[PDB]
């Protein structure tokens, strides 16, 4: 009694999770870009 | 509840305009004076206080306003768009236009003078009062009006908007044109 319990959020734990989520997000975006790049190249097969 | 003197101060701008938008106020004190414009849009206010004075324009668009008592002084215009006003009291000193669009208005004071434009668009009003004088543009589009009184005065344009007028005033001097 006479005290209030705050939150247990570990600020560093969230920040290091953020930077890893950013890098993994960006790497998958590159996978999307190289997927359409391959698709565009494999379109001259029907380009007689 | 009701607006107090201290609550009034927290809704006033530098030049003295009271802003009550979306605020939960039900009634204003009698003899109320506003330095500038008054805005009671979207308010649960159903009645305006007696002796109300507005130094600017009254804004009550899409509000629950229903009754305005006589003796109210408004320097600017009156905008009661989308409110619940059913009748207009006699003796209102209006320094501007009167916009009553989309209101359940049914009756108007006899020989009413509008120093600006007048709107009865999409209103269930059945007939205009005798001796009506309008110094601006009159819009009756979408309303239930179909017969004009014997004498009326419009100093601007008259817009029918779609309603059919069959009995035109005997004495009418128009400063503008008539549009369907």
């Amino acid at each position: 009694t006479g005290a209030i319990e705050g939150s247990n959020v570990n600020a560093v734990g969230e920040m290091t999770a953020l930077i890893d989520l950013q890098r993994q997000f960006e790497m998958q975006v590159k996978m999307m870009s190289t997927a359409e790049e391959m698709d565009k190249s494999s379109d001259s097969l029907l380009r007689m | 509840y009701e607006l107090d003197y201290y609550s009034k101060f927290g809704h006033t701008d530098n030049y003295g305009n009271l802003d009550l938008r979306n605020k939960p106020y039900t009634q204003l004190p009698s003899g109320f004076v506003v330095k500038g414009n008054l805005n009671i849009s979207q308010t649960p206010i159903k009645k305006l206080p007696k002796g109300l004075d507005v130094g600017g324009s009254l804004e009550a668009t899409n509000s629950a306003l229903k009754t305005i008592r006589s003796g109210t002084k408004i320097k600017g215009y009156a905008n009661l768009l989308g409110s619940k006003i059913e009748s207009w009291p006699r003796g209102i000193k209006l320094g501007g236009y009167l916009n009553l669009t989309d209101t359940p208005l049914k009756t108007l004071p006899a020989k009413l003078r509008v120093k600006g434009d007048l709107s009865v668009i999409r209103t269930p009003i059945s007939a205009l009062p005798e001796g009506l004088v309008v110094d601006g543009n009159l819009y009756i589009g979408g309303s239930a009006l179909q017969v004009f009184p014997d004498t009326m005065t419009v100093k601007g344009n008259i817009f029918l908007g779609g309603n059919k007028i069959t009995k035109w005033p005997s004495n009418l001097t128009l400063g503008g044109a008539v549009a369907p």
Binding site: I4, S7, N8, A35 | -
Partner: protein, 100 residues
Amino acid sequence: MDRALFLAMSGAKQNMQALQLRANNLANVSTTGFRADLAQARSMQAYGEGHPSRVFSMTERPGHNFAQGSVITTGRDLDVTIEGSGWISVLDHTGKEGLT
């Protein structure tokens, strides 16, 4: 076109969801009696005919950080904090009992 566009899109979409989950914890640093939400990823393989090469990843909330929060001393009689592990029984506006 190659189904790797959607395999990577589904991972990028989930990474945003985990980012939002972590964002709520940082927005709730000062909240009283707030248990931080845990975020992780689960691998769910696309079983079927063909070579097992396509596995999806979706984020989930496995649990919460039930550690003791930072106690603030206010010197107020009507302020209490739970020592160690515990909860306080409260009913919300729906009259439904819930631990706080």
